Amino acid sequence: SVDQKAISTIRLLAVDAVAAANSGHPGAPLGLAPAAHAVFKKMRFNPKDTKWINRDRFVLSNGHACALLYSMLVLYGYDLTVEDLKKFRQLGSKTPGHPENTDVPGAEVTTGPLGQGICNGVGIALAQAQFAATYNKPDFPISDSYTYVFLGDGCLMEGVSSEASSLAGHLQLGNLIAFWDDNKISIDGSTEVAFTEDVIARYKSYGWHIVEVSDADTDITAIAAAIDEAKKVTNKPTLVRLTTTIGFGSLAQGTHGVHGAPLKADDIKQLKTKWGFNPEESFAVPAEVTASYNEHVAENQKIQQQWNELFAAYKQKYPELGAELQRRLDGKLPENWDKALPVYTPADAAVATRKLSEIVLSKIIPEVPEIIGGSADLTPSNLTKAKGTVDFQPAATGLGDYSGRYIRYGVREHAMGAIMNGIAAFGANYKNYGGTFLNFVSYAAGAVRLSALSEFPITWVATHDSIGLGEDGPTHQPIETLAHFRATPNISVWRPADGNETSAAYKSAIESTHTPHILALTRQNLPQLEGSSIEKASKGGYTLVQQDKADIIIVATGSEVSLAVDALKVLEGQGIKAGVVSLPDQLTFDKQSEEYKLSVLPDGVPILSVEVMSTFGWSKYSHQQFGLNRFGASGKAPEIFKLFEFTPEGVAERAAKTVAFYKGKDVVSPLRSAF
């Protein structure tokens, strides 16, 4: 049949791609080709409009199997060709060894790190439910799409998927349909060596629906029926158990050796002949397969055409919502939304930056409907919920509604991070955030790094940034955390010192389209600074106190800017004139012009950094660094600062030593380099 020919075509494209690269993973593509064929036949999508907001989404969570995904995209006429398949795993190609959303048309997210994709699917489905609840009206199903996810044993072993699966079951996400590649083989061999749990019983315990397909090597009728069954269960996510043979058809099928290395040439020949293909030919695409797939594309394009007319009629019937939806699909924030950002003066009271963050959210959430977010069981400590908003919950629970804007993530930082990536991936201008303590953002590093690589504008509201949190002690107090994330490409790490800087940090985070943000916020109160503004803090680094005859410049962030200002006064009494630079975001600063940066960190003056955490990175901006390179302590926060000499006198002492160290030396800006 044509279906059988399509499945063989998919299998052989994937094998041939791996063969051409002499690198990659043929086993799961061989095993999952029937399911991929069946799922894509049920999916609504437009290869010529990858951003249609009512498309079904597909996520390959077992991203090593991406020769399968690329083969589907090529066969369906996405902007990816057989010539691209021939360049699988080659430098600069559109077919990298794991899928990258920035590079691969039709890759919704970046996978390869196991466990992430299923969580991203949870986030796509969460966003779809919120979006539909916000916009759909009687006779206007603006959003009714599904989220289809493939995942393997490795994804099911990774704890992040347990977190997201528990939460997705709680949230009754009925448009999520996941498929487990139940092939009983991982890199170390049989799953009997390490993974003997009853997966289906576990998924039932989360409140998922289950469908089992015992012969998923051939039974596409049952796979299609499982999708239809899943669509009838509107209040539970579904797991479809696909019992497959890894490497189906290979001489080496059912073995770990077929997971992750190219097949032998004679094996590929026998695959081809058993399936009616020419063993002398590679990258074959039978025209009848193209014709069949083109029929489905044409039907999907007519569905999108009708959706466009539905949307036009929606704008006439619901003018306000229609204009809001249009603006979001255009990628534009509300005009002058930033006029809602709070502004402060030096006469205003001292406030912790966690509380300033609460106040920002309170003002901007009503103005910007595409902001949603939550906390990982730290809502009353991170201060992440705007009073009066409703939680995102299924209405059946009585605890919220899908139109809600605040997500109770539970104690699930890693899944929160990956779910945030999925919400961003949904599109529609979602600007979404997640609260935890800065030290526990580290639990989510796997997902945070992918926010950066995937270029998603997600935001971590990362409170309790330092030893300033006090008594909870060193298991809670960051030391290495900012260095870790600043050292990751494409992460804006804001550490605002006061009210105006906190507003600048949010302006950046919400306006972002390609850069994730981490906002490092305090438990303890900080004064409003003389010289701060949204305008200057938006530059990432700025001169807070200008001193034309400076003996030293002190560059600082966050809670240490006020400390630097107090140290300047101590230094005055010692006959030393200091300037102060505030550096709320190193990435934003780095992106400013060379001349702007040199105006902040000029030649001819020693520069001392002050930040109560690791000194790593700080030599970009300073000659000497005063930081904290040891773990913290459990005690009242002011006593910890005193212990470590983060006091006006301790800063002044180190500043005076810095001035003395450079006496008789020629000093150039830390911004200069040899290459």
Added chain:
Amino acid sequence: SVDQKAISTIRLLAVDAVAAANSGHPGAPLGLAPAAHAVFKKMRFNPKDTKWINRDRFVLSNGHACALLYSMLVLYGYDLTVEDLKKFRQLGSKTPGHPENTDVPGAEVTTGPLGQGICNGVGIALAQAQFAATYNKPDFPISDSYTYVFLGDGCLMEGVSSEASSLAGHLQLGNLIAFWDDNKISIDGSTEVAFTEDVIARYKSYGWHIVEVSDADTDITAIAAAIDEAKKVTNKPTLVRLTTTIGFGSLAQGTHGVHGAPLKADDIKQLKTKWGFNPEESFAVPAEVTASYNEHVAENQKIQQQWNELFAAYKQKYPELGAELQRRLDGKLPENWDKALPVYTPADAAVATRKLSEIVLSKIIPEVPEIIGGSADLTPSNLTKAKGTVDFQPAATGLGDYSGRYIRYGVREHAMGAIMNGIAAFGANYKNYGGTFLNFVSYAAGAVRLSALSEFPITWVATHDSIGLGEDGPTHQPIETLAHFRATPNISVWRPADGNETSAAYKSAIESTHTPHILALTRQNLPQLEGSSIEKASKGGYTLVQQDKADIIIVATGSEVSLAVDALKVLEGQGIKAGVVSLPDQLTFDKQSEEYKLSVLPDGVPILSVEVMSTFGWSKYSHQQFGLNRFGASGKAPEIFKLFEFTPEGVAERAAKTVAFYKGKDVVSPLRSAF
């Protein structure tokens, strides 16, 4: 009864400690006091010998509840007193706001970051099973102890606990007995808002035994019976569901407000009067409670006394095993064990450092019985198993034995990291390791940081360290990872360049008693270096190529040392004389004498670092830094190095620019500072 008085004493000590600090968590201590009383009565331990190797272990995974743990330790006469309780959460005290094994007698591990402690308990139980299988003989139950863990809803939400619980069920760890504080309250309120899964059904799906105690606020008889029941189930870990009221007895019992803030003074008064205590008194310890607890201590001490005689008789009956056990309990490695480390010369072939690591393990595992380890489903890629060894599995599976030495962790990096901490915490000189790709050590950051804070000598065998891995691409290629871990206090991060350096890295990792190690290892082959040795590499940094008239010194690590050596030859043809420093471990180097370090990085010469990852940290050792501060690429590894100019010519160009940049300047060692 005295039991009732003991429970009240525990509750009120915990509340009074929180009150004195005006900080901390009274709710779970109030709810778990009955269970703590019952468990400690069943436990065998010696307050005067916290290291008795056959003690039962207790782990408080819900570490915020540590006022409960501290109260138990005080009441039992550990080296912790009521005066220490009065200093709860105060700077420098022995009663920090979360338990620290380095600080608190009777704290086996450091908890506070949720999810970790239960995984540590899995590791303690894994070690006990391996230890018992290694040493026990007929009539000689050298090791027969249990591992008791308390954990809450937050621990059950964290994915790391799912990973470890799946694995513990697979491993049939019948001496693990965990207790879930089922109080239905977390920080964000009722668990109905975020955590509605059927926990018991999930634990059954992992192969755990379940006991439910429906009135754990009072029914210590049932808690004791649950322990007895768990002890009869020798082939499954047990979860005991303790249905409790958070804050039991408080006016605010059963609310989120009692989780994490001090009780009101009038609330404490009514607690005291309802339980027969004086509301005017704090830190009361009724002498009848002390007497009852002392009886149990005296009995436990007689049990340890008999164990000491059993051990003496064991040494007579099993002389070789007895001497091995004695040496391990003394904390000593085998005499001259390091003579087994492989040594190489520059005439030997190029080898990837992952393969050099395999070869080291092959030589040292037979010589050092306290080495055990595993991989997170990457055994044939990390090369972490010595040929001929048997896996750690329950014999019932046919796949291994508890005497085995190799652990199949599955795709569970985070739990692997926390399990490694538990194996170290068991003691008996265990030197344990865990393999994954360096980029996925980041999945385990929560546990890695605790290895550092807890001072455990665990080892990560972290292969595939860079873009040198090639085609798997940027989702697999570290950039930020070494900077992150080097910026964490107390982590040795070895990046050996060749065979001799890899042996030095293992010498350090195995000899460690207080510092975790990460060994960053290559996929790709590297040459044996002229000038390397175990002796010099043991210093962490050393002069590989000395040049008395150097125009520049190039400092490098790992795969970039050979690159620096090749660049030196290019530079010679440009009339530039270079020296080369190899810096296999920055932490070890930092610990050398100031004079040694200056002999490696002298004044008066520009120094350029070369390492194909983040430049963060490198200014400690260099004036200019050539690194990779962007994500990688999917392609053949040599092509990626060429793309980013990590070639002999690209290094030479930057070295020549560095020499020119410092012409006419006075240059002092990067090791100098102002303070």
